[PDB]
Design a protein around this ligand. Structure first.
Ligand SMILES: Nc1ncnc2c1ncn2[C@@H]1O[C@H](COP(=O)(O)OP(=O)(O)OP(O)(O)=S)[C@@H](O)[C@H]1O
Ligand SMILES: Nc1ncnc2c1ncn2[C@@H]1O[C@H](COP(=O)(O)OP(=O)(O)OP(O)(O)=S)[C@@H](O)[C@H]1O
Ligand SMILES: Nc1ncnc2c1ncn2[C@@H]1O[C@H](COP(=O)(O)OP(=O)(O)OP(O)(O)=S)[C@@H](O)[C@H]1O
Ligand SMILES: [Mg+2]
Ligand SMILES: [Mg+2]
Ligand SMILES: [Zn+2]
Ligand SMILES: [Zn+2]
Ligand SMILES: [Zn+2]
Ligand SMILES: [Zn+2]
Ligand SMILES: [Zn+2]
Lengths: 284, 204, 637, 668, 57
C-alpha cells in the first residue's frame, strides 16, 4: 500500500557537444532571437510579448524576414520543416513568456501561439505543385467562406471506465489538421479493462477555437472557361474570426495534406494550416 | 500509547500505521545489506543525473534518459547506473517472537517482522529480549494468489528505537548514573557476599 | 551488393592450397619425394572418406610459419577458407570426391600440436583458436543430428530456400528468393529437406595427475562432429584437438560482477513524438573437437597384422622362451617382494578365461575374481596399486569412498529442470578390465549387495527416474580386505575372519591370505628391499620384462580361445575329487570349504594358464598348476 | 583544478603526489612510521625502494607493481593519497597505473638507458595495493563502504571455472558481410541497429558472432571469513571474490589468503525472463591483490604446486607463492644451522609457551620438516608426510600443540573427531546459491593437501569415519567413486591426531594397546605414537607452575622464558628453506643401520610392522633435512630410532607385557 | 569527462627538480628535503664537474 516512486534529474556535467539540429539548441536559438533581436534599437519582439501578456493575448507575431536577418540556417529549418520547428518556437515563446509574466506580476498561461507573417514573394494558388507539400507557402486570394468556430481539446482529463485511473492528455501542437492525430488511449495505461476505456471529464478539460476558411484565387485572374480554384484552410486560437468572407488576404501557411478529387488512386486533398493572415484595406 | 509494550497477537490491524512498542525476543537477524532507495544514473548525452526512487521489493531500471534535455530532444541518451551516487540504506530484517509470559494458554507463539534501517542496524541479535518501538506499516501481499480475498497486506515494524531488557556486558559505559550506583553498592560494603547471596535469594 | 571479401582469408586459403598441393616428404630410405596430402586425397577418394588428416608439424614449415600462426590463432575465422581451399584442390585433383556418392561435407582434422593444454589452462584469450587439450572421458552423448544446411519455406512465398548455412545456431535467412515477397522474419524449417551432421557431446574431467592441491576436478563439454563421433568412450584418457568456443550459459545469473548485456542502438532511428531488444551476453567455454585420439582385437591375426615388426621380433622371442610363465610371474608387481602366489593370481586375472554361454543362456563367465586378505602392512594395497596403471581399463577405488551409485552406474541431473542421464560407474569404467576395490570390508552392506548384483549376472539394472537401462559390467574384481579386529585369526575360519557377506564371498575364485611372521632372514631381506627401493628409484627394480612388453604380451595372449583335451577333462574330475577328499577330512579344518564353484574356478584358472603359455590347447599340466594354485590358497585352521 | 565529480581526487595533484612518492621513498620512512627507528640499517633502508622495484620490473619484463598502502602513510605528501586510494580505488588506481607508466618512461629517458621504449609504451602497467587498513571484518561493512578498498582474510573453499567476460563484441552483416567491433562500456554493448556501410542500410542485418568476439578471464572464488574480531553469537561467513584476467586460478581451495579488493554491490535480477532487479543489492569483492605468504606461517609445499608455479609463470600473474629469502637471511639460516644445539633450539622454538615436552616438540618439528618426496621415473610416488598421534593423560597440552601446528602450517583443517564425517573429510556435492547448480567442494583431508590436518579427539570419532584416513595416511590419496565424482584426489597431508586412553586416564595396569584402543591397521599408519603421561613429580609441578603463572605477570605476555628461542618469523623461514632446497639421500651406512634397527624391533604388546621401517627412513630424512644435510648418515637413523622408542616410552615398558613402569617415567 | 571545479570538494617558487626527479611547490623546502640533501652530500654525483674545478686551477 505504497505511493508512486518519483523520477527526477539534475545537471552535473557537460554532456556531448551541443549539436545545432538538437531540439534544445533550436529552442535556445529561438529564445535568443526573441530576447535579443533589435529593430531600430528596439527589442520589438520582447516588448510585443510583454504587451501581449498584459492584454492576455497568448501569442507572438513574428516577421520571418527578421528571422532571416538573425539566423539563416534555422530559418531554412522553419521554412522547410514547419511542422517540426514551429512547436519549438512556441516552446521558446512559452518559456520567455513565463519568465516575463512572473517577473512583471510583482509591479497558469498556456502554450503560446506563433503567428508568423511575411512580405516575401507569394505563390499563386494555381502554381502550387506537390513540391510545396509540408512546407511554408505564402499565397494570396479572397476568402469566400468562414465556418463556425469548433472546439478542439488542448488539454483533456480522462478517466478509465472499469477503474478510476485519472490521466491527462495535453494537445499543445498539431491543432491544425482535418483529422485528429492524437486520440484517447486504447488501453487503461494503468499497467484488463477493455478497448478505449477512457472517458473525458469535460468540466476539467480545456478547449480552443478552430475555423475553416475557404480561400479562392481572385476572379479577375481566372481562365475564361474554367472554374476558379479554391483551397481549404484551417486556423486556430488567435487566428480565428480575423477575416470575413470577401476579404482579400495574404495567407502564410503550411501546404499540407488530408485524406477524404473524386475517382483517383493514392490522391490526397491539399489544404493550408494558417500560420498568419494579412488582411489588406477592405470594406469598413 | 507508543511505549506500552504489546504482544505480537495484540498488534491487530487497528494499530497499522501507528508508532507502537512490541515486547518480544529476537529469533533471527539477517545480514546488513544495501537496500537501494533512490537509484542514480548518469547520462553521457546531456550530462544529467537521473534519480529513480525505489519503493517495493523489485524495480525496473531506466533505459532511456528522462531529463529535460533528452526528453525535449529526439536523440535520447542511454543512461548508466552510478552506484556511488545512488542512495542506499543499511537494511536488516529481524524476527521478533512472543515471550512465554505473553502467549495464551495452549497457543504457539507467533512472530513479527522488523525492518531495521539506517544507523539502527546491528542493534538486534537473536536471543535478545527487547522492547522494539517502530511504525507498524503494511506491505504488499506475498502469500498464495489463490488465497487472496481482497487487498490483503503483509505487515512489518519499521524499527525506530530498541530497548534492551538485559544490557550486554560489551556495551558498558561508566556514565555518571552508572558510577553513583556502583559507589552506593561498594560503600554498603561486603560486595562479594552481597552479590553471591543475591543470586536466587529464595534458594536458601 | 558488393560483398565484403576477407583479404587475409583469401590469402590463407591460397596458402593452404599450395600446402595441400606442393607439400613433399622425404621417405626413410624407401623412396623419393612423395606428396603426402595428394596421396591422402586419392586415398579418401578410393575409400570414400570424409575426413582429411592434416599434420600441424607439416603445416608449421610452410609459409615460414605464417600459415601456421593464422590457422592456429584464428581457426574459427579461417576455417571456411580452409574448407574452400580443400574443396578447390579436390575439384582439380580427384574431382569425383565432391559428391556424396548433394555435396560432400569435408572435415579437416588437425593433430600433432606442439603443446597439450590442461582443462585448467583453458583461458578466454584462446576463444576461436586451434589448440589441444587432454582429459578423462566420463560421459558421452548418443550421436545426434545437428542442423548444418537448413531449408526454409516462407509463409508469403511458398518457395524453398536451401543451403542456409547454420554456422553455430539456428539462423533463419534474411532475403527471399523471389523479389516480390520482401519478407525477412517469417520462415519455417522443413526437416526432411534440410541437412544434418553427427554431433556427440563428450564430458571430460581433469586427469588425476593434473588436479592441483586441494582443488576439485574440472569438467568440460567437448563437441565431436562428423567422423570423430563415438571415438571416445567413458573411462579413456583422450586428447582432443579443435576450437575453444563459447556457448550461452544462462546459469551465470546471480553471479557477482557486471554481467555483459547488449542493447539496440537508438540513434539514427527517426522517432516521432518499447523497442528494448536487450539480451544477456553470458557465455561458458566449450570445446569443438575435430580430432580425437586415446592416450575388436578378439581376432588374433588382425591384432598381429597392425603391429610393428620389432615388437613381433620380441613377442615371438618371449613365446619361444621356456620359463615364460615364471618370468611373467616375476615381472608382476616388481616393487612387492616375495608374494609369488598373489602375483600368479594377478597375472591369471589379467589374462582371464573364456566366456561360455549354454544353450538356454546360463552364460558362464570367465573372469577371475580375487580377494587378498591378511595381517596389516603385507603389501595388499601395493598389488592393487600395481594393477591400476598397468592393466588397461582398470579402475581403483576404496571401500569407504565408494557408493552403490559410484561403482555401478548412477542416474544424475546436471541442471535442475533438465532431464536425467546415466554417468558410468567404477564397474563400467573398468569394463573388460579390473576393478581394484581396496578395503572391501569397510564398504557398506548395501554397496556390497549392489556389487553382488554385478558379480552374479555381469550386468547392472537401473530403473530409477524413468531410465530403465540394463548396463553390462564385464569386470574382474580384485579386492583387498582386512579381517575383523584388524588382525587375522589363525584359529578361525576365513568366513569368521571376514565380515564380507557370503553371496559376495562365493564369486571370489581365489582367496590369498598373507600373514607376516618374525622370521629373521625374511625380515632382513624385506627391509633391504624397502630401503633399496627408497635409496634407488628404478635401479632397485629389476623385472625380467618391462611394463611395455609385458602389456604387449598380455594383449597378445588375451586373443586366444584355450581348449582342454580329452585327458584334461578326466584329470579335472580327479583333481576336483582330490579337493573334495581333502576338505571335510576331520582334522584339516579348511578356511573355506569346497563345492562346484571351486571346480569352475579351476577350469577358468587353467584357461588363464593356457593363455599365459600362449597355446590354444590346455595341457593337463596346466590343470595341475591351476589345482596347486587353488589348493595352496586354502589355509588350514 | 578540475577534481572528479563525486570524489576528492584531482588527476594532476594525485599524479604529482604519487610520482614524488615513487621517486623519493625509502623504507626508513615506514620504519620511522612504525616506531621502529632502531631497526633502521643504512644499507637497504636508505635506497629509493620503488625506484629499485621499477628497475627490477623493467629488467624482468613484468607489469604489476605491488604497492604497500601503508607506505603512503610514511610519506608526508601522500598522507592524503592514502585516504583517496582507500575511498576511491578506481580513479586512484587508474591514476597510479598511468603514473607508473610515466615513471618508467622517465627512468629510461632521463638516465639515457639502452632499453627500447616501444614495448614499454604499449605495455599496460598495474598497481596492486594490499596493506590497506585491516579492520571491520566483512559483515561490519555498511552500504557507505561500497566501492571502497577493503582487506579480507580467509580460506579459499571453491573456485568456478574460467568465465569469459566479453570486452569486444564482433558483429557481422547477414547481407554484405561487413563487420564492426563494438567496445563494452560499463557492462553494456551497443548492438548496431543498422549496417554502418553506406552501400546497404539493412536494419537488422547485423548478427553477433560469439566465437569471434574478444573475451577476458573472470573467476568467482568462495571465501570463508576469518576476521580478527568476531562479534558474539555470529557464525562463519562466506563471500564471493572476483578475480580478473591475471588473478584467475591463482587461488586454490584450502589456501589461507589475505585479499585486498574493492567492496562492490550489484543488483540481482529476480527472474531470467523479465529485466526486473531486486531492491536488495548483492555484495562481493573485486580482487586487486592476493597475498598467500604469511610471515608467521610455513611456505606452501612447492612439491605440490610445481605445475601451478609454472602455470603462474605463463599467466604472468606475479603472485608471490613463497616468501623471498635474501642473502643476509640465507647467511643467518646457515649460521643457525651450524649451531651445536640446533635440534634443541628448533624443538623449543616450536610452541615456546607450552611447557617442556622435548620429544613431543621434536616430533612436531620433524613432521613440519617432513621426509623426502621421491617420484619414480617409471611410475610411482613416495611422500615424506609424517603422521603423529598424541595419546595421553588428560590436560597434557596435546590440544595446544595441535592448535600451534594448525596456525603455523600453510594449509590444513582442524577437526574434532565426533564433528567430522567420512563425506565431510572428502569431496562432497553442495548447491551454489548464485548459479543454483550442483558443485563439488573439498573435504578436510583434501583442503589439507600439502599441509597438516589436525584431528582432536581421535578416539571419539567412529570406525567408519576413521576408514577414510587409511588411504590418506598410507597412499596420500583419496580414490573416490561416488555418484558424480570418480577420480583420485591428492591428499598429501600429514595427520596430527590427539587422543586420550579409554577411561580418560592411562591405566598402568592395562597394556599400551588396551589404553590407546586403535586397530592395528590404523596404529601402524602413525609414524610417531606419543604417550604423554601426567606423572606427579614435585619439581615438574614447581616448574610447570612457574611457566603457567609467568604468562599472567603481564597482561599480554612476551615469552622469552628460555635460554633462547627463535622467532616464528625466522623459524618458519628456516623450515620452508629446508623443505624447498634440501632433499636428503640415504647412504649405505644409513641403510645398514636402518635394517639393523628394524630387525631389532622385529623381535599383548604393540606390533612393529613394515611401515615402521618407512617411518624410520622418512624420520631420518626429516632429521637430515633439519641440519641442511643432503645425505643421511647413521646418526640421523639413530635419532629417528631413539625418537620412535621414546615416543611410546619403551624405556619404561616391559618387553613381555606392555605395562608402563610409573617409577621409570622420565618427565623431568 | 567527469572533471569539475575544486570549488566543489577538495612560496610562489614552484617547478621541477632534475636532481630529485620530484616536483616541488616551494624551493626553500625542497632544498632542505631528505632526498635533495642526500643527493648534495654525495660527491659521486658531482664527479665530472670535479674535474673542472681544478683542471682550470
Ligand atoms: N531416458 C533414458 N533412457 C535410457 N537410457 C538413457 C536415458 N537417458 C540417458 N540414457 C543413457 O545415457 C546415455 C547418454 O546419452 P544421452 O542421454 O542422449 O546424452 P546425455 O549425456 O544426456 O547428453 P545431452 O546433454 O542430453 S545431448 C544414453 O546412451 C543412455 O545409455
Ligand atoms: N612384501 C613386501 N614387499 C614390498 N613392500 C612391502 C612388503 N610388505 C610390506 N611392504 C611395505 O609395507 C607397507 C605396506 O603398506 P600396504 O601395501 O598399504 O599394506 P596393506 O597390507 O594394505 O596394509 P593394511 O591392510 O592397509 S593395514 C608399504 O610401505 C609397503 O611397501
Ligand atoms: N605442559 C603444559 N604446558 C603448557 N600449558 C599446559 C601444559 N599442561 C597443561 N597446560 C595448560 O592446562 C590446560 C590443559 O592443556 P590442554 O591443551 O587442554 O591439554 P590436552 O592434552 O589437550 O587435554 P585433553 O587430553 O584433551 S582433556 C591448557 O589450558 C594449558 O594452557
Ligand atoms: Mg592397505
Ligand atoms: Mg585437548
Ligand atoms: Zn482501467
Ligand atoms: Zn540524458
Ligand atoms: Zn518470402
Ligand atoms: Zn551490410
Ligand atoms: Zn632536488
Amino acid at each position: 500500500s505504497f505511493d508512486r516512486p518519483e523520477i527526477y534529474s539534475a545537471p552535473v556535467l557537460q554532456g556531448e557537444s551541443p549539436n545545432d539540429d538538437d531540439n534544445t539548441e533550436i529552442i535556445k536559438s529561438f529564445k535568443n532571437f526573441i530576447l535579443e533581436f533589435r529593430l531600430d534599437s528596439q527589442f520589438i519582439y520582447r516588448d510585443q510579448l510583454r504587451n501581449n501578456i498584459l492584454v492576455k493575448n497568448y501569442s507572438l507575431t513574428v516577421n520571418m524576414e527578421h528571422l532571416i536577418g538573425y539566423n539563416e540556417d534555422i530559418y531554412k529549418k522553419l521554412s522547410d520543416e514547419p511542422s517540426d520547428i514551429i512547436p519549438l518556437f512556441e516552446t521558446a515563446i512559452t518559456q520567455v513568456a513565463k519568465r516575463i509574466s512572473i517577473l512583471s506580476r510583482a509591479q497558469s498561461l498556456p502554450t503560446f501561439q506563433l503567428i508568423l507573417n511575411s512580405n516575401a514573394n507569394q505563390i499563386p494558388l494555381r502554381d502550387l505543385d506537390s513540391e510545396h507539400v509540408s512546407k511554408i507557402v505564402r499565397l494570396s486570394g479572397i476568402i469566400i467562406s468562414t465556418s463556425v468556430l469548433s472546439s478542439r481539446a488542448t488539454y483533456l482529463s480522462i478517466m478509465c471506465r472499469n477503474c478510476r485511473h485519472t490521466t491527462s492528455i495535453t494537445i499543445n501542437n498539431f491543432n491544425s489538421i482535418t483529422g485528429n492525430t492524437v486520440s484517447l488511449p486504447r488501453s487503461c495505461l494503468s499497467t484488463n479493462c477493455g478497448p478505449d476505456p477512457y472517458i473525458i471529464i469535460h468540466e476539467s478539460s480545456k478547449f480552443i477555437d478552430q475555423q475553416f476558411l475557404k480561400l479562392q484565387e481572385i476572379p479577375e485572374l481566372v481562365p475564361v472557361g474554367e472554374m476558379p480554384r479554391n483551397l481549404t484552410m484551417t486556423c486556430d486560437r488567435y487566428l480565428t474570426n480575423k477575416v470575413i468572407p470577401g476579404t482579400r488576404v495574404t495567407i502564410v501557411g503550411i501546404y499540407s495534406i488530408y485524406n477524404s478529387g473524386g475517382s483517383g488512386v493514392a490522391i490526397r486533398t491539399p489544404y493550408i494550416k494558417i500560420l498568419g493572415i494579412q488582411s489588406d484595406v477592405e470594406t469598413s | 500509547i507508543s511505549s506500552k509494550p504489546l504482544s505480537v497477537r495484540q498488534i491487530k490491524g487497528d494499530f497499522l500505521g501507528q508508532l507502537i512498542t512490541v515486547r518480544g525476543i529476537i529469533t533471527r537477524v539477517s545480514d546488513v545489506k544495501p537496500a537501494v532507495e533512490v537509484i542514480a544514473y548518469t547520462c553521457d548525452q546531456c550530462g544529467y543525473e537521473v534519480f529513480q526512487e525505489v519503493n517495493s521489493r523489485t524495480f525496473t531500471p531506466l533505459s532511456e534518459c528522462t531529463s529535460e534535455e533528452c526528453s525535449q530532444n529526439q536523440t535520447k541518451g542511454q543512461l548508466f547506473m552510478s552506484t556511488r551516487a545512488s542512495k542506499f540504506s543499511a537494511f536488516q530484517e529481524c524476527k521478533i517472537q512472543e515471550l512465554s509470559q505473553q502467549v495464551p494458554v495452549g497457543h504457539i507463539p507467533r512472530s513479527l517482522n522488523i525492518h531495521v534501517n539506517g544507523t539502527l542496524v546491528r542493534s538486534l541479535s537473536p536471543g535478545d529480549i527487547v522492547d522494539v518501538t517502530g511504525i507498524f506499516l503494511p506491505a504488499p501481499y506475498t502469500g498464495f494468489k489463490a488465497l487472496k480475498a481482497g487487498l490483503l497486506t503483509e505487515t512489518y515494524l519499521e524499527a525506530q528505537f530498541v530497548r534492551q531488557h538485559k544490557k550486554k556486558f560489551a556495551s558498558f559505559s561508566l556514565t555518571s548514573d552508572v558510577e553513583e550506583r556502583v559507589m552506593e553498592l561498594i560503600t554498603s560494603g561486603d560486595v562479594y557476599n552481597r552479590l553471591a547471596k543475591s543470586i536466587a535469594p529464595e534458594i536458601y | 551488393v558488393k560483398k565484403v571479401d576477407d583479404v587475409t582469408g583469401e590469402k590463407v586459403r591460397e596458402a593452404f592450397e599450395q600446402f595441400l598441393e606442393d607439400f613433399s616428404v622425404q621417405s626413410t630410405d624407401t623412396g623419393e619425394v612423395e606428396k603426402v596430402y595428394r596421396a591422402q586425397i586419392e586415398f579418401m577418394k578410393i575409400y570414400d572418406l570424409n575426413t582429411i588428416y592434416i599434420d600441424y608439424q607439416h603445416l608449421s614449415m610452410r609459409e615460414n610459419g605464417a600459415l601456421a600462426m593464422a590457422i592456429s590463432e584464428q581457426y574459427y575465422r579461417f576455417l571456411p577458407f580452409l574448407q574452400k581451399g580443400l574443396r578447390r584442390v579436390v575439384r582439380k585433383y580427384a574431382p569425383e570426391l565432391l559428391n556424396t556418392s548433394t555435396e560432400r561435407v569435408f572435415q579437416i582434422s588437425f593433430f600433432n600440436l606442439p603443446t597439450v593444454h590442461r582443462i585448467r589452462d583453458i583461458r578466454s584469450e584462446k576463444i576461436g583458436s586451434l589448440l589441444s587439450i587432454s582429459g578423462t572421458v566420463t560421459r558421452t552423448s548418443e550421436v545426434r543430428p545437428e542442423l548444418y544446411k537448413a531449408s526454409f519455406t516462407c509463409d508469403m512465398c511458398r518457395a524453398i530456400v536451401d543451403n542456409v548455412e547454420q554456422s553455430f545456431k539456428y539462423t533463419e535467412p534474411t532475403f527471399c528468393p523471389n523479389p516480390s515477397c520482401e519478407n525477412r522474419a517469417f520462415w519455417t524449417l522443413n526437416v526432411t529437406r534440410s541437412r544434418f551432421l553427427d554431433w556427440q557431446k563428450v564430458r571430460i574431467q581433469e586427469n588425476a595427475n593434473e588436479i592441483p592441491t586441494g582443488s576439485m576436478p574440472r569438467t568440460l563439454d567437448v563437441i565431436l562432429r562428423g567422423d570423430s563421433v563415438e571415438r571416445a568412450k567413458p573411462g579413456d584418457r583422450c586428447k582432443f584437438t579443435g576450437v575453444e568456443i563459447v556457448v550461452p550459459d544462462v546459469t551465470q545469473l546471480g553471479l557477482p560482477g557486471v554481467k555483459p548485456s547488449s542493447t539496440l542502438d537508438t540513434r539514427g532511428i527517426s522517432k516521432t513524438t518499447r523497442s528494448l531488444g536487450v539480451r544477456d551476453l553470458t557465455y561458458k567455454i566449450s570445446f569443438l573437437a575435430c580430432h580425437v585420439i586415446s592416450i575388436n582385437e578378439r581376432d588374433q591375426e588382425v591384432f598381429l597384422n597392425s603391429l610393428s615388426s620389432d615388437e613381433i621380433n620380441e613377442l615371438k622371442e618371449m613365446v619361444k622362451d621356456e620359463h615364460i610363465y615364471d618370468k611373467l610371474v616375476r615381472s608382476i608387481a616388481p616393487a612387492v617382494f616375495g608374494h609369488e602366489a598373489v602375483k600368479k593370481g594377478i597375472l591369471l586375472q589379467m589374462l582371464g578365461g573364456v566366456h561360455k554361454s549354454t544353450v538356454e543362456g546360463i552364460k558362464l563367465r570367465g573372469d577371475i575374481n580375487i580377494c587378498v586378505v591378511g595381517d596389516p602392512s603385507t603389501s595388499k594395497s601395493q598389488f592393487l596399486k600395481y594393477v591400476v596403471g598397468f592393466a588397461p581399463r582398470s579402475v581403483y577405488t576404496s571401500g569407504k569412498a565408494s557408493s552403490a551409485a559410484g561403482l555401478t552406474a548412477a542416474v544424475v541431473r546436471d541442471e535442475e529442470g533438465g532431464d536425467y542421464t546415466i554417468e558410468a560407474g567404477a564397474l563400467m569404467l573398468a569394463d573388460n578390465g579390473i576393478c581394484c576395490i581396496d578395503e572391501f570390508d569397510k564398504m557398506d552392506i548395501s554397496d556390497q549387495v549392489a556389487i553382488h548384483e554385478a558379480m552374479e549376472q555381469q550386468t547392472i539394472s537401473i530403473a530409477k527416474a524413468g531410465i530403465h537401462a540394463t548396463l553390462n559390467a564385464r569386470t574382474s574384481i580384485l579386492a583387498a580386505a582386512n579381517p575383523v579386529g584388524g588382525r587375522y585369526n589363525r584359529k578361525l575360519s576365513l568366513r569368521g575372519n571376514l565380515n564380507m557377506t557370503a553371496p559376495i564371498m562365493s564369486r571370489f575364485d581365489l582367496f590369498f591370505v598373507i600373514l607376516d611372521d618374525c622370521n629373521e632372514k625374511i625380515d632382513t631381506e624385506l627391509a633391504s628391499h624397502i630401503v633399496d627401493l627408497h635409496m634407488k628409484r628404478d635401479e632397485a627394480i629389476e623385472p625380467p620384462f618391462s611394463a611395455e612388453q609385458l602389456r604387449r604380451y598380455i594383449k597378445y595372449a588375451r586373443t586366444f580361445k584355450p581348449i582342454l583335451t580329452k585327458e584334461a577333462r578326466s584329470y579335472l574330475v580327479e583333481k576336483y575329487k582330490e579337493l573334495r577328499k581333502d576338505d571335510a577330512q576331520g582334522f584339516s579344518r579348511s578356511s573355506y570349504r569346497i563345492t562346484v564353484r571351486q571346480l569352475e574356478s579351476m577350469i577358468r584358472l587353467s584357461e588363464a594358464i593356457a593363455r599365459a603359455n600362449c597355446v590354444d590347447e590346455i595341457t593337463p599340466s596346466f590343470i595341475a598348476e591351476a589345482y596347486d594354485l587353488l589348493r595352496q590358497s586354502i589355509i588350514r585352521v | 583544478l578540475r577534481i572528479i565529480w563525486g570524489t576528492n581526487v584531482s588527476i594532476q595533484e594525485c599524479t604529482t603526489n604519487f610520482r614524488n612518492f615513487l621517486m623519493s621513498f625509502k623504507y626508513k620512512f615506514r620504519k620511522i612510521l612504525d616506531e621502529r627507528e632502531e631497526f633502521i640499517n643504512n644499507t637497504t633502508d636508505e635506497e629509493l625502494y620503488y625506484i629499485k622495484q621499477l628497475n627490477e620490473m623493467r629488467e624482468l619484463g613484468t607489469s604489476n607493481l605491488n604497492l604497500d598502502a601503508r607506505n603512503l602513510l610514511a610519506y608526508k605528501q601522500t598522507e592524503d593519497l592514502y585516504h583517496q586510494l582507500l575511498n576511491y580505488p578506481q580513479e586512484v588506481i587508474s591514476i597510479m597505473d598511468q603514473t607508473i607508466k610515466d615513471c618508467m618512461v622517465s627512468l629510461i629517458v632521463d638516465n639515457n638507458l639502452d632499453y627500447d621504449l616501444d614495448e614499454i609504451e604499449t605495455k599496460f602497467y598495474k598497481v596492486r595495493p594490499y596493506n590497506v587498513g585491516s579492520c571491520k571484518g566483512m559483515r561490519e561493512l555498511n552500504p557507505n563502504d561500497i566501492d571502497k578498498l577493503i582487506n579480507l582474510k580467509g580460506l579459499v573453499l571453491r573456485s568456478t571455472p574460467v568465465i569469459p567476460d566479453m570486452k569486444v563484441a564482433f558483429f557481422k552483416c547477414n547481407v554484405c558481410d561487413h563487420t564492426m567491433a563494438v567496445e563494452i562500456d560499463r557492462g553494456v554493448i551497443q548492438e548496431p541497429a543498422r549496417c554502418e556501410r553506406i552501400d546497404c542500410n539493412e536494419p537488422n542485418s547485423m548478427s553477433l558472432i560469439h566465437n569471434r568476439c574478444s573475451f577476458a578471464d573472470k573467476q568467482v572464488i568462495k571465501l570463508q571469513e576469518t576476521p580478527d574480531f568476531v562479534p558474539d553469537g555470529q557464525t562463519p561467513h562466506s563471500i564471493s571474490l572476483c578475480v580478473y584476467d591475471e588473478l584467475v586460478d591463482s587461488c586454490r581451495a584450502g589456501d589461507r589468503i589475505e585479499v585486498t579488493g574493492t567492496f562492490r554491490s550489484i543488483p540481482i535480477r529476480a527472474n531470467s525472463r523479465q529485466r526486473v532487479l531486486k531492491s536488495l543489492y548483492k555484495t562481493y569483492v573485486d580482487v586487486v591483490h592476493v597475498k598467500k605468504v604469511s610471515d608467521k606461517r610455513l611456505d606452501v609445499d612447492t612439491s605440490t604446486i610445481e605445475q601451478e608455479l609454472m602455470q603462474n609463470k605463463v599467466d604472468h600473474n606475479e603472485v608471490e607463492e613463497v616468501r623471498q629469502i635474501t642473502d643476509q637471511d640465507l647467511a643467518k639460516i646457515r649460521e643457525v644451522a651450524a649451531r651445536e644445539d640446533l635440534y634443541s633450539l628448533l624443538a623449543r622454538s616450536i610452541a615456546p609457551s607450552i611447557y617442556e615436552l622435548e620429544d613431543v616438540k621434536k616430533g612436531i618439528l620433524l613432521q613440519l620438516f617432513g621426509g623426502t618426496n621421491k617420484t619414480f621415473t617409471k611410475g610411482g610416488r613416495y611422500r615424506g608426510d609424517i603422521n603423529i598421534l598424541l595419546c595421553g593423560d588428560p590436560s597434557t597440552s596435546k590440544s595446544q600443540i595441535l592448535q600451534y601446528v594448525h596456525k603455523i602450517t600453510p594449509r590444513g583443517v582442524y577437526t574434532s573427531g565426533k564433528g567430522s564425517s567420512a563425506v565431510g573429510l572428502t569431496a562432497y556435492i553442495t548447491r551454489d546459491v548464485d548459479t543454483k547448480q550442483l558443485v563439488l567442494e573439498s573435504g578436510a583431508l583434501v583442503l589439507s593437501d600439502g599441509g597438516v590436518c589436525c584431528i582432536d579427539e581421535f578416539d571419539k570419532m567412529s570406525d567408519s569415519t576413521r576408514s577414510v584416513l587409511h588411504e590418506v595416511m598410507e597412499q596420500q590419496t583419496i580414490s573416490i567413486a561416488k555418484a558424480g565424482i570418480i577420480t583420485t584426489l591428492n591428499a598429501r597431508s600429514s595427520i596430527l591426531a590427539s587422543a586420550n586412553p579409554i577411561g580418560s586416564r592411562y591405566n598402568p595396569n592395562l597394556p599400551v594397546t588396551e589404553n590407546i584402543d586403535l586397530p592395528p591397521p590404523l596404529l601402524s599408519r602413525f609414524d610417531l605414537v606419543y604417550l604423554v603421561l601426567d606423572k606427579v613429580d614435585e619439581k615438574n609441578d614447581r616448574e610447570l607452575a612457574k611457566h603457567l603463572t609467568n604468562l599472567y605477570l603481564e597482561d599480554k605476555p612476551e615469552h622469552i622464558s628460555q635460554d633462547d628461542v627463535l622467532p616464528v618469523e625466522f623459524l618458519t623461514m628456516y623450515i620452508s628453506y629446508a623443505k624447498e632446497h634440501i632433499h636428503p639421500i640415504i647412504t649405505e651406512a644409513a641403510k645398514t643401520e636402518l635394517v639393523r634397527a628394524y630387525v631389532g624391533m622385529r623381535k599383548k604388546r604393540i606390533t612393529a610392522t613394515t611401515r615402521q621401517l618407512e617411518s624410520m627412513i622418512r624420520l631420518a630424512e626429516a632429521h637430515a633435512k633439519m641440519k641442511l644435510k643432503n645425505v643421511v648418515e647413521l646418526e640421523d637413523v639413530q635419532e629417528a630410532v631413539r625418537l620412535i622408542r621414546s615416543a611410546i616410552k619403551d624405556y619404561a615398558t616391559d618387553p613381555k607385557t606392555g605395562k608402563i613402569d610409573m617409577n621409570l617415567v622420565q618427565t623431568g | 569527462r567527469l572533471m569539475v571545479d575544486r570549488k566543489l570538494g577538495v612560496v610562489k617558487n614552484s617547478g621541477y627538480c632534475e636532481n630529485c626527479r620530484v616536483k616541488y611547490e616551494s624551493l626553500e623546502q625542497h632544498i632542505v628535503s631528505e632526498k635533495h640533501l642526500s643527493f648534495a652530500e654525495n660527491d659521486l654525483n658531482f664527479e665530472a664537474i670535479d674535474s673542472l674545478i681544478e683542471n682550470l686551477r
